RNA sequence: ACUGAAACUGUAGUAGAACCAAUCGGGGUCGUCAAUA
């Protein structure tokens, strides 16, 4: 089994997402900025409703971003003045322009979960007295006893030539209600 | 690529129970003192 990962360097976040848009369809995304950690959803075409002004770096702009859906995850992090490295992670071999392909073999993928902050207060709201509110891109409404989880897959592979396994990556998949 | 926030080491608890400031004693009564000539 192969984990395919695609690198492009010296690329802005706005351009990195636009390069991946065919794959980041409907993808949830998390944007790290000096003052906010905002959750965003790309539309079915993989576009953001204010992508330039949201993804720019110039003024307390996004320095790191993640976007994920079922099939793939895009990661980006700033390296100089708003240019960065993009890495897209995919289960399947796919065509991208400018990106360089690579892969790593993995022994098995194991699912994980991550409970989000808050109880239920398209878009839904969780809230917790500890943090106040958290808004999540989630289309179905939430019953008062629901909790929203985030799912991921960890890929185990041999690191050492002595055969020692480790989880070489963890790709995010989707938000899920449990 | 940015300090977490907020939170009384507090609540209940008698330094107290037991232990005699007490036991015995007539306000009484006689020859001593000095050393020599």
TrEMBL record:
Keywords annotated in UniProt: Plasmid
InterPro entries: CRISPR-assoc_Csx19
Protein name from the UniProt record: TIGR03984 family CRISPR-associated protein
Species for this entry: Synechocystis sp. (strain ATCC 27184 / PCC 6803 / Kazusa)
